[PDB]
Amino acid sequence: AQPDVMAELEQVVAKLDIRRAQVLVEAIIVEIADGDGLNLGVQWANTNGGGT
Amino acid sequence: KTVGTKLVLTPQINEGDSVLLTIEQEVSSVGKQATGTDGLGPTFDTRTVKNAV
């Protein structure tokens, strides 16, 4: 380009070529799970009387 | 599919010292060459990271 644009492109480039900063990203996924089933049940069977 | 230790890297040099590295890498495997899958084709254990640093 014209020397006028060369000097303008030269500032654009200098700004645009800046050392891009780096990022360390730690994620922390914590899950906790449990639970209590209970099955208690009583059956009575009688020949004479009846069964449950 | 090429599954093994892969490094695909296109380095780019700062005039002076510090390298911009575009990395796509992984350590991947077809489990066992004598083991199947619950699916249909082969499966892969991969450890991958594709980033520029």
Swiss-Prot record, chain A:
Name of the protein this chain belongs to: Secretin ExeD
Family indicated by similarity: Belongs to the bacterial secretin family. GSP D subfamily.
UniProt free text on domains: The N0, N1, N2 and N3 domains are periplasmic, while the secretin and S domains form a channel that is partially inserted in the outer membrane. The N1, N2 and N3 domains each form a periplasmic ring. The secretin domain forms a double beta-barrel structure; the outer barrel has a diameter of about 110 Angstroms while the inner barrel forms the central gate with a small pore in the closed state.
Domain of life: Bacteria
Location relative to the cell: Cell outer membrane
Range covered out of full length: 332 to 383 of 678
Gene: exeD
Subunit structure: Forms a cylindrical channel with 15 subunits.
Functional description taken from the UniProt entry: Involved in a type II secretion system (T2SS, formerly general secretion pathway, GSP) for the export of proteins. This subunit forms the outer membrane channel.
UniProtKB/Swiss-Prot annotation, chain B:
Transmembrane segments: none
Superkingdom, taxonomy of origin: Bacteria
Subcellular localization, as worded in the UniProt entry: Cell outer membrane
Function noted in UniProt: Involved in a type II secretion system (T2SS, formerly general secretion pathway, GSP) for the export of proteins. This subunit forms the outer membrane channel.
Domain notes: The N0, N1, N2 and N3 domains are periplasmic, while the secretin and S domains form a channel that is partially inserted in the outer membrane. The N1, N2 and N3 domains each form a periplasmic ring. The secretin domain forms a double beta-barrel structure; the outer barrel has a diameter of about 110 Angstroms while the inner barrel forms the central gate with a small pore in the closed state.
Assembly information from the UniProt record: Forms a cylindrical channel with 15 subunits.
Family, per entry: Belongs to the bacterial secretin family. GSP D subfamily.
Protein name: Secretin ExeD
Gene behind the chain: exeD
Part of the full-length chain shown: 489 to 541 of 678
